[PDB]
Design a protein around this nucleic acid. Structure first.
Ligand SMILES: [Zn+2]
Ligand SMILES: [Zn+2]
Ligand SMILES: [Zn+2]
Lengths: 794, 242, 304
RNA sequence: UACCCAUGUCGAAGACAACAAAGUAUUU
RNA sequence: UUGAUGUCACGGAACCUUUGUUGUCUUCGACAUGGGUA
């Protein structure tokens, strides 16, 4: 029992319930699951009790008992040694401000943004101003009584919240409260349940099993391996807190918010890689006598430490979405967010093996060599590049426990498994690893990628935009790398987005029985898209990592405005801006990275052909990267790969007529004066179609290509650089330069799109695409008795 | 399919006092939502509804809480009936899709009873292979029992809920589980009802016969009609009764 | 009594638009079919099919244009040692358009008149001389007007358009909307009403994807696409293509040393040293309410 | 309950609309 | 808060599928205010 027998409110007061699953080896997907409570040893390290012994018990029985207690090394699933308030008030206040000022539509955005502040209270001082540099920003100065900015500034200066952990706790609780308030406005928090397959499955032991005696022999050795597992990519060990609703996908943490590499996952990955080495799945069910296959016999000798990190900063939050292939737009309901653990975290690693062979079995030596070469794929979400580790600084030695002197030394020290004994054992481990005899190459191969873009790029994050000092509507993605306890930001292109682009490129040009792979449901399916990219029933065979930019460019901000087609001025509320990375033909953006492909895919000429065709079309410029490609962003100048031995990359490689003379006649009278604008009256008939052309394939008979154009000025042209309204300095008189990108005179694509769209709308007699329908006109009355004033009465 | 057009046709016909009108309208709206959630090719339809003020008024009246919740149970019952009619013309995949559509739609005693029966029938599709039973079979039967117990907690005389509960309890026993508790008492209530509603009931009255050692209901079984597809199974029950 | 959406035919309202009908559409906020009350019963018009909507991605992409040669500036830069920056020009006041002028009253007689286009003219010469386009008086700095760095005529740019799954008539009418005709021009950029921003576009090249490994030159097929485009317009509208004629008359560029005078009236004629009527005089003379929508919808109708 | 006008001044828009999680075969 | 001549649970990777994306010219001229005189 616990010393002193204290009491607690219930099991959730002392530990957390966590799902533990069972993964089918061949499909790579979970077959079933069960749950248990885990209690952290740093909170409850110790239990105490008594053994009562009769006086007539022999001395040899007593010796055997004491030695057995020292030899006993694991109990209740854990290695062991045997010896002998503010956030509620703030939420209420902010909700009252929002509902008093009729700004409740911003509740969700505020909830997500405030959550983002959990990593540092200094971010409060950095919150954006308005476009005039003044405290009238549309979110943070609501209530301008006190504003939200003032409430947060006061909270950040409260001495109780000066500790970073307390600030993180405050931000998290406040974000959750505002999230739940925002959910009430949508009719309450409601989540779709699974029809079937939602119950736990517990192994059933067999009571008709027969008894056996087995010798195993007196030869018995223990090998100890020590080292580090280092995160070379971000990683994701999934675990949902049922009481935390705001985030959809969540990472496993310790109660003091350190990152945890759990024992269960490490054992599961070891068993998976051993079956990969032997190349034979284990079919055994839970219960009955122990399985005798070659993998289970090794796993019965293995021991591994549960490990945690020194690094304890909050996780990143990633946006994720799914695209409907027919419309080219987000699918219904397909917006969700994900916690991610940064790359660079370091975990202690300790493995032990007991057996009668003279060392580690040859299969395990091969697997540990695979891990030392950086192919420890350990965590979930592997297909989008999460969870690749390298085993570093490995050391080992073997202790012979048949030797009575060694065995007594071992018993005297509890096998050197506590911290101090471990720091003594490490003084006698030998550097390196034992070399495998029957070595087998790793099953995954790395392909290096380099992409060149001659245009601006954005991979949008609006939440980061809501809190960054720059204050535009959207900014590009960044991610963080750990160093010690420091976090460093890097601009990147998400692994998920790049996977999506390549998958779309492959699917749109292949068919199964004459149907595009974009249109299939993929039940009971064997198409190449399921074979390469996976499905809801099996894991994929290609893993994409994030791509990073070379030479670290700095973002630029562009302004935009929508034009009412009737008035010719700015449409009422539609003025906006963004912050893309600048890229141009003279100074293009350079993206680098890699993806991993399983060797049986590289060996298959058909799958290599498919991937080659898709990357050929990406290299041709048919698939831009990131958002807002309608206005010229994301254009690929070229894409090249290395590492395939050219198995994939082998596939990757009349004048225009004169325009007619116009028939239009306008007659001008030299003394008269004309109006600067006129209106074109449309035709009564607008030609509509209920079901436009789908995006899911290149349709036969229709055209795809590029038009290259020349533009010439006939009168002087103004296209301003509105990033600086004081260019000609020796409310003030504003002045602008002409638009430039890396000191190149340019015209944005959005300008040309709008200009050409107006004329195309007029030629085809289309609807007024932009038009302020809901405006209500009004006019002044006049000093007129009969027509006006005699009808208004007191 | 063009489900938007179907919504137009229903909105023309529908009046709110009439069961069939609301049944059809609810069905059409559910199918529209389903096609959106599936990212079907029907999502390319960009058209809307005509006669906007009328359509708005009729939809706003339908989406009254009591009207739509009333229509829900009736639509579920109608689908459950048509399934149990065409069950033996369907293949396994489409039997499965029908039942799972009913379950997802329904996720009032009529609703609960329909959902319990739907879960019972979804479980029946699973068959043991080798000496192992699928876990989802047990899961489905337990969920059927769970739904039944909401009704029976407040009306223990309800024959349909009681019969579904007893069928699921017998399937649990067949899967090698134990009977759920108070099986004896509920099985005694069933004998106080004393009438065969469906072929499964013959197996309940034999269980009652073997438990209470009472022969009264055996003459009902021997007089059962021979015009049945699973004739061999009925004859086996005749043999037990004899 | 009406929102402005009720002052035009329901067919010319945006395909995917806002609720203008009488009611509180929020009553259906929880349910998916709410979107069907905001969409036209017959679907998407050509420009929505080509350039896209919030629920349908577009099929054309417009890239950045880049200047080909050394800039030619309207005004020499302050430092003659640097040719890559121009000198300032000060514009007169830019104020918002008023629809109350085009729609003179609450009478249901008055519709939305049409799509606004600005005409081509050389009032930029007056502004370059530092004088107001209407009055001819010197322009003065204010917090409300702008100074800009402007290119001259004769500067050349290049850019590319990518397109996907177009019909031949769509590509034909897109090329027609780009290149127009010899004697016609587009408008671009700031201060269109002051004579700035006349530009002309010419196609250099069209290339086509045959399949994943072959692209081919499409310059030969341009006339065929133009023919199908005009045949499509005939199929839709038969002879009554008057909106095309009015569009051409507003795109017409003055040539042959022609010099139209184009400007807005002053508020009252006492404010104008040229002696023409102002808005307060025009509103019951030539642009009287019963006559205004006809004159505004007739290209190059003079006001003085 | 008939008649009549008078004065000259001034920036606007600053994001909006949509999606806010959903799925996840056990068999003629 | 166990019960004793019998516990492989270190006998089970929360795993698998999903592009923060679609639509939008940094544009632009007539409008404010409420009386006064018989
Ligand atoms: Zn095994
Ligand atoms: Zn497939
Ligand atoms: Zn349209």
């Amino acid at each position: 029992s616990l010393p002193g027998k204290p009491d607690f409110d219930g099991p959730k007061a002392i530990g957390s319930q966590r799902v533990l699953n069972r993964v089918d080896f061949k499909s790579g997907k979970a077959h079933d699951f069960f749950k248990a409570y885990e209690v952290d040893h740093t909170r409850f390290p110790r239990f105490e009790g008594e053994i009562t012994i009769d006086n007539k018990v022999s001395a040899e029985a007593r010796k055997l008992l004491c030695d057995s207690l020292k030899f006993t090394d694991r109990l209740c699933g854990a290695l062991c040694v045997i010896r002998f308030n503010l956030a509620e008030k703030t939420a209420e206040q902010i909700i009252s401000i929002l509902d008093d000022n009729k700004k409740t539509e911003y509740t969700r955005l505020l909830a997500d943004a405030i959550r983002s502040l959990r990593r540092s209270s200094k971010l409060v001082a950095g919150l954006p101003k308005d476009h005039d540099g003044k405290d009238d920003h549309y979110l943070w100065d609501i209530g301008k009584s006190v504003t939200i900015r003032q409430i947060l500034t006061t909270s950040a200066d409260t001495k109780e919240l000066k500790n970073a952990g307390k600030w993180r706790e405050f931000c998290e609780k406040l974000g959750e409260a505002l999230y739940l308030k925002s959910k009430d406005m949508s009719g309450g928090l409601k989540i779709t349940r699974r029809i079937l397959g939602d119950a736990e499955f517990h192994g059933k032991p067999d009571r008709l099993e027969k008894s056996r005696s087995v010798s195993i022999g007196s030869v018995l050795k223990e090998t100890v391996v020590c080292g580090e597992l280092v995160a070379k990519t971000p990683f994701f060990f999934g675990a949902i807190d049922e009481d935390a609703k705001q985030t959809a996908l969540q990472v496993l943490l310790t109660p003091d918010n350190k990152y945890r590499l759990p024992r269960s996952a490490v054992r599961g990955i070891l068993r998976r890689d051993l079956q990969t080495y032997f190349d034979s799945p284990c079919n055994a069910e839970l219960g009955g006598r122990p399985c005798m296959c070659k993998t289970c016999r090794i796993m019965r000798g293995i021991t591994v430490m549960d490990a945690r990190s020194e690094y304890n900063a909050p996780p990143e939050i990633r946006h994720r979405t799914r695209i409907n292939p027919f419309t080219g737009t987000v699918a219904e309901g397909a917006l969700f967010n994900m916690e991610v653990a940064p790359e660079g975290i370091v975990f202690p690693f300790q493995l032990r093996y007991r057996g009668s062979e003279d060392g580690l079995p040859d299969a395990l030596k091969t697997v540990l060599k695979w891990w030392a070469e950086g192919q420890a794929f350990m965590s979930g979400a592997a297909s989008t590049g999460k969870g690749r580790f390298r085993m570093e600084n490995a050391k080992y030695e073997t202790l012979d426990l048949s030797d009575e002197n060694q065995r007594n030394d071992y018993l005297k020290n509890w096998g050197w498994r506590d911290e101090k004994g471990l720091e003594e054992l490490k003084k006698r481990l030998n550097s390196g690893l034992p070399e495998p005899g029957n070595y087998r190459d790793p099953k995954w191969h790395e392909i290096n990628v380099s992409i060149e873009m001659a245009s601006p790029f954005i991979n949008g994050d609006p939440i980061r935009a809501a809190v960054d000092k720059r204050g535009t509507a959207v900014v590009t993605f960044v991610k963080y790398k750990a160093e010690g306890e420091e976090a460093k930001p890097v601009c990147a292109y998400k692994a998920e987005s790049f996977r999506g682009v390549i998958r779309s490129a492959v699917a749109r040009i292949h068919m199964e029985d004459g149907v595009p792979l974009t249109e299939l449901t993929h039940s009971d399916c064997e198409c190449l898209l399921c074979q390469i990219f996976g499905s809801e029933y099996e894991a994929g065979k290609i893993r994409f990592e994030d791509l990073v930019f070379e030479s670290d460019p700095e973002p630029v901000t562009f302004d935009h405005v929508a034009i009412d087609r009737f008035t010719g001025g700015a449409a009422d509320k539609k003025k906006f801006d963004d912050s893309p990375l600048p890229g141009s033909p003279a100074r293009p953006l350079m993206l680098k990275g890699s993806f991993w492909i399983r060797r049986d895919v590289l060996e298959d000429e058909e799958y290599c052909k498919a991937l080659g065709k898709a990357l050929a079309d990406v290299n041709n410029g048919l698939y831009p990267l990131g958002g807002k490609s309608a206005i010229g962003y994301g254009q690929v100048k070229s894409l090249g790969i290395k590492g395939d031995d050219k198995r994939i990359s082998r596939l990757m490689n009349v004048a225009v007529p004169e325009k007619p003379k116009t028939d239009a006649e306008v007659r001008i009278e030299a003394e008269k004066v004309y109006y600067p604008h006129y209106f074109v009256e449309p035709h009564k008939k607008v030609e509509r179609e209920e079901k436009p052309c789908g995006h899911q394939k290149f349709h036969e008979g229709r055209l795809t290509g590029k038009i290259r154009c020349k533009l010439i000025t006939k009168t002087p042209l103004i296209v301003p650089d509105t990033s600086n309204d004081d260019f000609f300095r020796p409310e003030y008189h504003k002045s602008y330069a002409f638009f430039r990108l890396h000191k190149q005179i340019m015209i944005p694509g959005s300008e040309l799109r709008g200009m050409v769209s107006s004329v195309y709308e007029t030629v085809t007699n289309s609807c007024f695409r932009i038009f302020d329908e809901t405006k209500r006109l009004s006019w002044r009355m006049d000093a007129d008795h009969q027509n006006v004033l005699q009808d208004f009465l007191p | 399919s063009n489900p938007i057009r179907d919504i137009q046709d229903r909105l023309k016909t529908a009046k709110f006092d009439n069961k069939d009108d609301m049944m059809n309208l609810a069905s059409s709206l559910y199918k529209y939502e389903k096609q959106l959630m599936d990212s079907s090719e029907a999502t390319l339809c960009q058209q809307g509804l005509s006669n906007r003020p009328n359509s708005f008024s009729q939809l706003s009246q339908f989406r009254d809480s009591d009207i739509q919740s009333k229509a829900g149970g009736q639509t579920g019952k109608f689908w459950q009936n048509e399934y149990e009619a065409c069950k033996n013309f369907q293949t396994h995949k489409e039997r499965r899709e029908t039942l799972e559509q009913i379950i997802r739609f329904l996720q009032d005693d009529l609703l609960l009873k329909t959902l319990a029966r739907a879960y019972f029938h979804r479980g029946l599709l699973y068959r043991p292979k080798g000496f192992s039973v699928p876990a989802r079979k047990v899961e489905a039967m337990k969920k059927a029992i769970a739904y039944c117990e909401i009704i029976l907690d407040k009306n223990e005389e309800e024959s349909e809920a009681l019969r579904i509960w007893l069928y699921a309890a017998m399937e649990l026993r067949r899967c090698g589980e134990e009977y759920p508790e108070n099986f004896a008492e509920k099985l005694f209530y069933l004998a106080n009802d004393g009438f065969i509603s469906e072929l499964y009931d013959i197996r309940l009255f034999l269980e009652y016969t073997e438990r209470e050692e009472d022969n009264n209901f055996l003459d009902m079984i021997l007089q059962e009609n021979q015009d049945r597809e699973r004739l061999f199974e009925l004859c086996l029950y005749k043999a037990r009764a004899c | 009594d009406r929102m402005i959406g009720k002052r035009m035919s329901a067919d010319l309202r945006p395909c995917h638009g806002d609720w203008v009908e009488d009611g509180d559409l929020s009553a259906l906020n929880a349910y998916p079919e709410k979107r069907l009350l905001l969409r036209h019963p017959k679907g998407l018009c050509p420009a929505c099919r080509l350039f896209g909507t919030g629920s349908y991605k577009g099929r054309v992409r417009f890239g950045f244009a880049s200047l080909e040669n050394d800039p030619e500036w309207l005004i020499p830069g302050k430092n003659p040692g640097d040719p890559f920056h121009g000198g300032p020009v000060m514009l007169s006041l830019l104020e918002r358009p008023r629809p109350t002028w085009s729609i003179p009253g609450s009478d249901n007689k008055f519709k939305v008149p049409g799509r606004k286009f600005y005409v081509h003219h050389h009032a930029w010469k007056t502004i370059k001389d530092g004088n107001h386009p209407t009055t001819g008086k010197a322009i003065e700095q204010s917090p409300n007007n702008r100074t800009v760095e402007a290119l001259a005529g004769g500067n050349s740019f290049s850019f590319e358009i990518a397109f996907e799954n177009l019909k031949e008539w769509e590509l034909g009418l897109l090329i027609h909307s780009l290149q127009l005709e010899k004697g016609l021009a587009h408008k671009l950029g700031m201060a269109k009403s002051m004579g700035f921003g006349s530009v002309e576009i010419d196609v250099e090249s069209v290339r086509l994807r045959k399949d994943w490994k072959q692209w081919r030159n499409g310059n030969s097929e341009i006339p065929n696409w133009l023919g199908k485009g005009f045949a499509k317009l005939k199929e839709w509208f038969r002879d009554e293509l008057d909106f095309i004629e009015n569009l051409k008359k507003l795109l017409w560029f003055p040539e042959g040393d022609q010099a139209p005078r184009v400007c807005y009236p002053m508020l009252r004629k006492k404010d104008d040293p040229n002696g023409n009527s102002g808005y307060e005089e025009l509103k019951d003379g030539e642009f009287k309410k019963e006559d205004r929508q006809k004159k505004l919808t007739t290209p190059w109708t003079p006001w003085a």
